[PDB]
Amino acid sequence: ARKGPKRHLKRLAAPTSWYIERKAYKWAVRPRPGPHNMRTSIPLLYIVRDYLGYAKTAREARKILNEGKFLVDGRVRKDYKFPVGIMDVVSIPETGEHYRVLPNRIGKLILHPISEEEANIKPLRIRNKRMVKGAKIQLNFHDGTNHLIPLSEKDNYFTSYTVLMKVPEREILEVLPFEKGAYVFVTQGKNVARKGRIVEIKKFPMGWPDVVTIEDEEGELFDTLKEYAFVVGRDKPRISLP
């Protein structure tokens, strides 16, 4: 990138969270800008071809996508570069199967089967909150999408809360506060994919991030960053987890 943006990606330099053979070929798919970031998402082509195995080559994979066979959060996606990320839902209505994308115990992305009833909800962590013209409130989520609320409701929402959203209509149906006793799932770091309940919260001076303590099922305590803790229920999970 001497004069401008990069458009290519070598296999050896690909993100470490994909399931991919790094020496089989030279190039990999450089993902398009979109919802999540490079460290927590994977292009759709690898989901079609490498993970589920409905195609052998990229060319016939593009023929499936251009016919409208895959839904992500209930919306048709045709771009083979489109990123799919944490807590997203993948639906194939023709075969009638649904999956949720989740990190592994070693940090890689996997597809977890779920029921059709649960496939209509998506949990969204509140990443930021601001004031917008007309004195309305805009909520900015962990996957980059936004929502608007009136000034009357401004005290029901704070950062790190989780909103259960109905897709594709994008209508709110639940709010899960972040506090002691909440049920959390870890999405990054050394303690990735562990889950439990919140025990303590600690804070530091001068912009150092804050840390939380979590108790798991067997009674062990472990710490992590506050922003790595995803709230999934009051005292039991609201979604199916492995």
């Binding site: 409905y54 023929k63 075969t95």
Partner: protein
């Protein structure tokens, strides 16, 4: 030569079925594509004009070979999905 089917998997998105098989044949040459197609068609009672054999592969010191084949329910879909070279190689269409 004797044929044993190992797995048969359906693909509703493409509209085909994918078949994996083994051929056991001590003391014989590698089976031809014609013989394999005829035997495979008869065992499965499948129309022969919409059946493609992707490959037949032999190994170093084995008495058996591994094969992979595909069956399409419609001729138009087959002509639309498969590359030209695999149809020419299997005798389905004639070269230009």
């Amino acid at each position: 030569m004797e044929i044993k089917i190992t797995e048969v998997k359906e693909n509703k998105l493409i509209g085909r079925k994918e078949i994996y098989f083994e051929i056991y044949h001590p003391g014989e040459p590698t089976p031809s594509r014609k013989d394999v197609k005829g035997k495979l068609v008869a065992m499965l009672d499948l129309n022969p004009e919409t059946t493609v054999i992707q490959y037949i592969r032999s190994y170093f010191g084995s008495y058996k070979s591994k094969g992979y084949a595909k069956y399409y329910y419609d001729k138009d879909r087959m002509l639309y999905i498969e590359p030209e070279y695999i149809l020419i190689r299997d005798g389905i269409i004639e070269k230009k």
